[PDB]
Write an enzyme that holds these catalytic residues in place. Structure first.
Site, PDB file in Angstrom:
ATOM      1  CB  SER A 157      -0.978   0.036   1.180  1.00 18.42           C
ATOM      2  OG  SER A 157      -1.992  -0.949   1.043  1.00 18.42           O
ATOM      3  CE  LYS A 163      -3.438   1.167  -1.526  1.00 21.06           C
ATOM      4  NZ  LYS A 163      -4.561   0.794  -0.623  1.00 21.06           N
ATOM      5  CB  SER A 182      -4.778   1.204   3.529  1.00 25.22           C
ATOM      6  OG  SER A 182      -3.623   0.711   2.876  1.00 25.22           O
ATOM      7  CD  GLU A 242      -4.012  -2.495  -4.174  1.00 26.44           C
ATOM      8  OE1 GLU A 242      -3.172  -1.664  -3.761  1.00 26.44           O
ATOM      9  OE2 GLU A 242      -4.143  -3.639  -3.675  1.00 26.44           O
ATOM     10  CE  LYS A 293      -1.362   3.760   2.279  1.00 24.76           C
ATOM     11  NZ  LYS A 293      -1.528   2.849   3.443  1.00 24.76           N
ATOM     12  N   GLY A 346       2.126  -0.280   4.745  1.00 28.16           N
ATOM     13  CA  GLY A 346       1.768  -1.339   3.818  1.00 28.16           C
ATOM     14  C   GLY A 346       1.926  -2.705   4.456  1.00 28.16           C
ATOM     15  CB  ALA A 347       0.242  -5.352   5.519  1.00 24.60           C
TER      16      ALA A 347
HETATM   17  C1  LIG Z   1      -1.622  -2.137   1.597  1.00 25.12           C
HETATM   18  O1  LIG Z   1      -0.505  -2.554   1.919  1.00 25.12           O
HETATM   19  C2  LIG Z   1      -2.857  -2.953   1.981  1.00 25.12           C
HETATM   20  C3  LIG Z   1      -4.051  -2.423   1.800  1.00 25.12           C
HETATM   21  N1  LIG Z   1      -5.276  -2.597   2.598  1.00 25.12           N
HETATM   22  C4  LIG Z   1      -5.904  -3.689   3.372  1.00 25.12           C
HETATM   23  C5  LIG Z   1      -7.361  -3.775   3.355  1.00 25.12           C
HETATM   24  O2  LIG Z   1      -8.009  -2.775   2.973  1.00 25.12           O
HETATM   25  O3  LIG Z   1      -7.919  -4.836   3.711  1.00 25.12           O
HETATM   26  C6  LIG Z   1      -5.176  -4.579   4.075  1.00 25.12           C
HETATM   27  S1  LIG Z   1      -3.357  -4.488   4.249  1.00 25.12           S
HETATM   28  C7  LIG Z   1      -2.670  -4.325   2.571  1.00 25.12           C
HETATM   29  C8  LIG Z   1      -3.194  -5.426   1.660  1.00 25.12           C
HETATM   30  C9  LIG Z   1      -2.601  -6.825   1.598  1.00 25.12           C
HETATM   31  C10 LIG Z   1      -3.399  -7.468   0.672  1.00 25.12           C
HETATM   32  N2  LIG Z   1      -4.422  -6.542   0.191  1.00 25.12           N
HETATM   33  N3  LIG Z   1      -4.264  -5.269   0.847  1.00 25.12           N
HETATM   34  C11 LIG Z   1      -5.391  -6.996  -0.795  1.00 25.12           C
HETATM   35  S2  LIG Z   1      -4.823  -8.719  -1.022  1.00 25.12           S
HETATM   36  C12 LIG Z   1      -3.392  -8.862   0.109  1.00 25.12           C
END
Ligand SMILES: *C(=O)C1=CNC(C(=O)O)=CS[C@H]1c1cc2n(n1)CSC2
Ligand SMILES: OC[C@H]1O[C@H](O[C@H]2[C@H](O)[C@@H](O)[C@H](OCCCCCCC3CCCCC3)O[C@@H]2CO)[C@H](O)[C@@H](O)[C@@H]1O
Length: 265
Positions: free
Chosen positions: A45, A48, A105, A141, A209, A211-212
């Site tokens: 993330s 972004k 996010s 995404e 910001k 991220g995961a």
């Molecule tokens: C950004 O690092 C991310 C965005 N958001 C969310 C969420 O809105 O649920 C969770 S942490 C991370 C992330 C990891 C994954 N997604 N989003 C979509 S699939 C694996």
């Protein structure tokens, strides 16, 4: 607390994963601390912020407006996406989408914004134009979070991300108002901002910001400094660790503690 580099090393050994870190002076661009700063890590993330840099550039050029309302469909929602989901009937402004992407996010918001900058290839082109020949976005995404071992797709390096963030925030690539907007979005992060403030000593500025991703991927791009001023850009990425989310957060916090206690450099 250990010296920053010693803490970074300890974190890496405890996580059984790769840590990448840079501490950079915001004003001058001077590198103060660096660990695996030229090694690749998935952006997750954190991409972004760069995304909305590209958006703001289009606003500056007259090819975009933050006011412009984008209408979308339920099929455009790629996951959870709490803000995008709530405004499904009435749409969201380009500015609102960036707020949702950066401060909450929201992943669907990021996709909608990507569709305004020419997709991943368009964003990578923007990066090349501002002198970043390393950072790359390849996917939309939610696939960009996959974090496959040794996969260069959707990655940056701590050094490149820090330099690019400095460029977007301070270089005059963006107009005064756009620079101010990008910074405010980071200041307004609802995901990690408040939590970080709750554990920072009085006087410490934070904007960020986070991220995961898969396989323990974790990241933060931040501005930090004493006396309520954004003195430094700090970028930390983690990858290929089996550690709990809680420990990964604790280790990043531990690196921060080391920076605070050994700030003079
Ligand atoms: C950004 O690092 C991310 C965005 N958001 C969310 C969420 O809105 O649920 C969770 S942490 C991370 C992330 C990891 C994954 N997604 N989003 C979509 S699939 C694996
Ligand atoms: O002498 C300096 C300070 O030492 C402690 O502060 C502690 C604090 O109590 C703890 O909560 C934090 O954890 C670190 C939490 C950092 C939050 C994440 C930071 C991010 C920001 C930039 C990107 C990566 C890290 O460490 C500091 C320094 O030891 C004392 O509590 C405080 O009174 C004193 O002013």
């Amino acid at each position: 607390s250990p010296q920053p580099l010693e803490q970074i090393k300890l974190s890496e050994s405890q996580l059984s994963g790769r840590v990448g870190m840079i501490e950079m002076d915001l004003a001058s661009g001077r590198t103060l601390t660096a660990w695996r700063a030229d090694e690749r890590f998935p952006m997750m993330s954190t991409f972004k912020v760069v995304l909305c840099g590209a958006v703001l550039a289009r606003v500056d050029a007259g090819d975009e407006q933050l006011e412009r309302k984008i209408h979308y469909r339920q099929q455009d929602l790629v996951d959870y996406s709490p803000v995008s989901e709530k405004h499904l009937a009435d749409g969201m402004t380009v500015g609102e989408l960036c707020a949702a992407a950066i401060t909450m996010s929201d992943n669907s918001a990021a996709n909608l914004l990507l569709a305004t900058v020419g997709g991943p290839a368009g964003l990578t082109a923007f990066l090349r134009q501002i002198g970043d020949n390393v950072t790359r976005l390849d996917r939309w995404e939610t696939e960009l979070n996959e974090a496959l071992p040794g996969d260069a797709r959707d990655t940056t390096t701590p050094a490149s991300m820090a330099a690019t963030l400095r460029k977007l925030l301070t270089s005059q690539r963006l107009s005064a108002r756009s620079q101010r907007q990008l910074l405010q979005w980071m200041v307004d992060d609802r995901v990690a901002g408040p939590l970080i403030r709750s554990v920072l000593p009085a006087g410490w500025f934070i904007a960020d910001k986070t991220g995961a991703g898969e396989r323990g991927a974790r990241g933060i791009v931040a501005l930090l400094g004493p006396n309520n001023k954004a003195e430094r850009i700090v970028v930390i990425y983690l990858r290929d660790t089996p550690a709990s989310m809680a420990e990964r957060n604790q280790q990043i916090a531990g690196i921060g503690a080391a920076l605070i206690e050994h700030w003079q450099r």
